[PDB]
Scaffold this active site. Structure first.
Site, PDB file in Angstrom:
ATOM      1  N   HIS B  43       1.445  -1.191  -0.056  1.00 31.32           N
ATOM      2  CA  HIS B  43      -0.005  -0.410  -0.221  1.00 31.32           C
ATOM      3  C   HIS B  43       1.107   1.183   0.053  1.00 31.32           C
ATOM      4  CE1 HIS B  43       0.187   0.745   4.911  1.00 31.32           C
ATOM      5  NE2 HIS B  43       0.137   2.092   4.549  1.00 31.32           N
ATOM      6  N   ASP B  99      -0.392  -7.454   2.750  1.00 25.70           N
ATOM      7  CA  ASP B  99       0.089  -5.670   2.390  1.00 25.70           C
ATOM      8  C   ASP B  99       1.286  -6.183   2.161  1.00 25.70           C
ATOM      9  OD1 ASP B  99       0.558  -3.757   1.745  1.00 25.70           O
ATOM     10  OD2 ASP B  99      -0.324  -2.769   4.093  1.00 25.70           O
ATOM     11  N   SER B 205       3.819   2.879   8.350  1.00 24.85           N
ATOM     12  CA  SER B 205       4.370   1.742   7.168  1.00 24.85           C
ATOM     13  C   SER B 205       4.989   0.218   6.481  1.00 24.85           C
ATOM     14  CB  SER B 205       2.953   1.699   6.291  1.00 24.85           C
ATOM     15  OG  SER B 205       1.633   1.589   7.160  1.00 24.85           O
TER      16      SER B 205
HETATM   17  C1  LIG Z   1       0.808   3.046   4.587  1.00 21.24           C
HETATM   18  C2  LIG Z   1       0.907   3.654   6.404  1.00 21.24           C
HETATM   19  O1  LIG Z   1       1.288   4.145   6.474  1.00 21.24           O
HETATM   20  C3  LIG Z   1      -0.059   3.501   7.223  1.00 21.24           C
HETATM   21  C4  LIG Z   1      -0.062   3.265   8.549  1.00 21.24           C
HETATM   22  C5  LIG Z   1      -1.294   3.032   9.853  1.00 21.24           C
HETATM   23  C6  LIG Z   1      -0.883   2.427  11.260  1.00 21.24           C
HETATM   24  N1  LIG Z   1      -1.705   3.278  12.596  1.00 21.24           N
HETATM   25  C7  LIG Z   1      -1.903   2.198  13.346  1.00 21.24           C
HETATM   26  N2  LIG Z   1      -2.407   2.943  13.855  1.00 21.24           N
HETATM   27  N3  LIG Z   1      -0.866   1.605  14.121  1.00 21.24           N
HETATM   28  N4  LIG Z   1      -1.618   2.337   6.932  1.00 21.24           N
HETATM   29  C8  LIG Z   1      -2.439   2.895   6.626  1.00 21.24           C
HETATM   30  O2  LIG Z   1      -2.912   4.202   6.531  1.00 21.24           O
HETATM   31  C9  LIG Z   1      -3.525   2.545   6.176  1.00 21.24           C
HETATM   32  C10 LIG Z   1      -3.315   2.689   4.326  1.00 21.24           C
HETATM   33  C11 LIG Z   1      -4.988   2.886   3.965  1.00 21.24           C
HETATM   34  C12 LIG Z   1      -5.607   3.741   4.819  1.00 21.24           C
HETATM   35  N5  LIG Z   1      -4.654   2.441   5.955  1.00 21.24           N
HETATM   36  C13 LIG Z   1      -5.275   3.167   7.105  1.00 21.24           C
HETATM   37  O3  LIG Z   1      -4.507   2.177   7.997  1.00 21.24           O
HETATM   38  C14 LIG Z   1      -6.953   3.070   7.649  1.00 21.24           C
HETATM   39  N6  LIG Z   1      -6.393   3.601   8.874  1.00 21.24           N
HETATM   40  C15 LIG Z   1      -8.092   1.870   7.713  1.00 21.24           C
HETATM   41  C16 LIG Z   1      -7.413   1.068   6.746  1.00 21.24           C
HETATM   42  C17 LIG Z   1      -8.467   1.455   5.879  1.00 21.24           C
HETATM   43  C18 LIG Z   1      -9.115   0.986   4.664  1.00 21.24           C
HETATM   44  C19 LIG Z   1      -8.971  -1.028   4.754  1.00 21.24           C
HETATM   45  C20 LIG Z   1      -7.728  -1.221   5.938  1.00 21.24           C
HETATM   46  C21 LIG Z   1      -7.432  -0.081   6.404  1.00 21.24           C
END
Ligand SMILES: *C[C@@](*)(O)[C@H](CCCNC(N)=[NH2+])NC(=O)[C@@H]1CCCN1C(=O)[C@H](N)Cc1ccccc1
Lengths: 36, 259
Positions: B43, B99, B205
């Protein structure tokens, strides 16, 4: 075969190589089951 | 990383910074698994919902870094990419299942004190060690707080941030969210009654969830920072790509071609 150079993996130059502990490292060890 | 702290220099020599060329932008973390191969979340590269599609040459990889922002002159190595391989069954539409993405660097890096590969786990090590309550470590340069909404504090660290948190059991992971959980995901973080706090966040991420084997004493990457709902919220857990369940695919692309 390997795409690699690594195989001394997970041992960290400034710490395990040098027989040093990082400052919060004993914590994760302490969780593995408990200690002792 | 929320509720973490500053990293010691060289403590995550596998940490990799995924960095966009133009505009210069931090996008994600990654990890060094070999002198030619870097592992991350898919992602970070492809997420059609947010109109997101990075190709091999929109991105730099910076290895050996500590500072988020300064060039560390004879420590960091900036590398370019040859190939990006995203899991063919990565599910971007629904729950971010599988992922994971691999990046083949264009030429190999040499290890130094600051740059050193993490191990991937084998059957016995993933079994041994990934049990609820056992602690791992997350590193990154990502958000210190939730920045999409008004909040007090810096959003952005100056140095790599470390947090050590426990695996939580699937029952609890699955009822903290209404997103569909999968066997390729685990969650980790403190329960509201555990006193302690901390989490990954956006920008984190692709970074490794690592664990130190008490047997040989080598750090192994057990997960990849994947998704979450806010950051450090009570009763919520960070979700992580389960590296051992996806090691067949990793192995199969890494070993595909010879060197
Ligand atoms: C891509 C990464 O930087 C990020 C990490 C977030 C970690 N958060 C915590 N509290 N540990 N991931 C993302 O932001 C992902 C990609 C799409 C949006 N997303 C989300 O986490 C949303 N918050 C939730 C989600 C939406 C759609 C499908 C799955 C999860």
């Amino acid at each position: 075969t390997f795409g690699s150079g690594e195989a001394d993996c997970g041992l960290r130059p400034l710490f395990e190589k040098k027989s040093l502990e990082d400052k919060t490292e004993r914590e994760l060890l302490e969780s593995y089951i408990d200690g002792r | 990383i929320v509720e973490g702290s500053d990293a010691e220099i060289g403590m995550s020599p596998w940490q990799v910074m995924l960095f966009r060329k133009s505009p210069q932008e931090l996008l994600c973390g990654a990890s060094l698994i070999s002198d030619r191969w870097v592992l991350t979340a898919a992602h970070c590269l492809l997420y059609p919902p947010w109109d997101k599609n990075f190709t091999e040459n929109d991105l730099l990889v910076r290895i050996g870094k500590h500072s988020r922002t300064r060039y560390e002159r004879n420590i960091e190595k900036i590398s370019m990419l040859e190939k990006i391989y995203i899991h063919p069954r990565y599910n971007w539409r629904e729950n971010l299942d599988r992922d994971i993405a691999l990046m083949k660097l264009k030429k190999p890096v040499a290890f130094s004190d600051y740059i050193h590969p993490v191990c991937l786990p084998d059957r016995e090590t993933a079994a041994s060690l990934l049990q609820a309550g056992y602690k791992g470590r997350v590193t990154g340069w990502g958000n210190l707080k939730e920045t999409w909404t008004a909040n007090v504090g810096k959003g952005q660290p100056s140095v790599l941030q470390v947090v050590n948190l426990p695996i939580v059991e699937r029952p609890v992971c699955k009822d903290s969210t209404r997103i569909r959980i999968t066997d390729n995901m685990f969650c980790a973080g403190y329960k509201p009654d555990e006193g302690k706090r901390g989490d990954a966040c956006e920008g984190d991420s692709g970074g490794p969830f690592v664990m130190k084997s008490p047997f040989n004493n080598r750090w192994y990457q057990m997960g990849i920072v994947s998704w979450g709902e806010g950051c450090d919220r009570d009763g919520k857990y960070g979700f992580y790509t389960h590296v051992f369940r996806l090691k067949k695919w990793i192995q199969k692309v890494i070993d595909q071609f010879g060197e």
